[PDB]
Amino acid sequence: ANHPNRQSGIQFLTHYNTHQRFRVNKDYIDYMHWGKEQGQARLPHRHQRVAFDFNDQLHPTRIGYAWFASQDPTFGHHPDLSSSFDPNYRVFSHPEHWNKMFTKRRPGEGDIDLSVLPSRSLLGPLMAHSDTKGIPYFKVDNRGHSNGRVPGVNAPFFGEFDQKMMQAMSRPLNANRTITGNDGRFSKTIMINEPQCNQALSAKTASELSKEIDKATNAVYS
């Protein structure tokens, strides 16, 4: 498409309400100042991407180490746990936020909304400074993490880290979803899933495993 304002292309892999990126009225992009880290200025920012590469990291799980006590004592901060990560984060774009169109584009001119970038003024911390301690001390909030008890964030974490998503998408090999599996071309992964009773197999589940094991093992391509 050679039409100006249609340059952003056809991307389906965005999160917006149109598959045509150039009809989207929400985030107008900035071709001059954007795309240092993301490649082209058209493409979605690192934190908004809904499609992921093989050798690239995927999104950090936000926290908002205490819970690794069971793990390797030396194991440092897990690469995917971040204090501040915002999937909704407004990136400053000039044509939206600083708009020089109605002016002659002289040095001070153009209309600016300051609601985008967090204020670096000292006015804020001065004006609000109080003897009462902050929200965290007061524990005003209900709820907590929206998923309830989470092994990484709230509760402690036991067992092993799966950094690739390999166990996280597997197909239950069983009617009970007790045993699950992951097959590559020539390899086969059988994973016992019973985290509640501490991986103690029942009579049915064991008689099942002796089926999945020898049906995986007597397979042609394994």
């Binding site: 892999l13 009809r23 499609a51 998503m165």
Partner: protein
């Protein structure tokens, strides 16, 4: 956004998500989650057109893991059956039976996904097996 435009369907942009994510060689796609969409995923994963998939019981979306082989994708083409929601195509068992036949040789190479009166998401092969007709969703190979 207007009248003349097509009326999109979760299947339509499911297929186009996957197609575009296959062209950019991505490992994971986040994709719309509806009954027949994750039906389509289970069928594709049966035939091995897709490395894996999961529904996290997230309301909006679920995720698909794509498979590549010999440097290009495992999916040549993937196309939705209908452009609108206002158009619904019905597949006679004899039609789904024609697909299977390449001039006298039995061809399961290409897969067609469809709804049944029974709310099952099936490929055309099982459909022909039990001789039921179904509503078209998409083709993939």
């Amino acid at each position: 956004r207007r009248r003349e435009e097509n009326l999109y369907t979760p299947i339509y942009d499911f297929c186009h998500r996957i197609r575009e994510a296959t062209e950019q060689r991505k490992r994971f796609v986040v994709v719309p989650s509806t009954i027949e969409t994750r039906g389509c995923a289970r069928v594709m994963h049966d035939h091995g057109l897709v490395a894996g998939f999961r529904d996290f019981h997230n309301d909006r979306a679920f995720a698909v893991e794509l498979k590549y082989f010999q440097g290009d994708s495992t999916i040549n083409v993937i196309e939705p059956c209908s452009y609108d929601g206002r158009t619904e195509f019905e597949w006679s068992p004899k039609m789904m039976r024609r697909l299977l036949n390449t001039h006298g040789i039995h061809n399961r190479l290409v897969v067609y996904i469809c709804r049944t009166a029974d709310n099952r998401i099936i490929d055309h092969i099982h459909a022909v097996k039990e001789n039921i007709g179904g509503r078209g969703l998409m083709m993939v190979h």
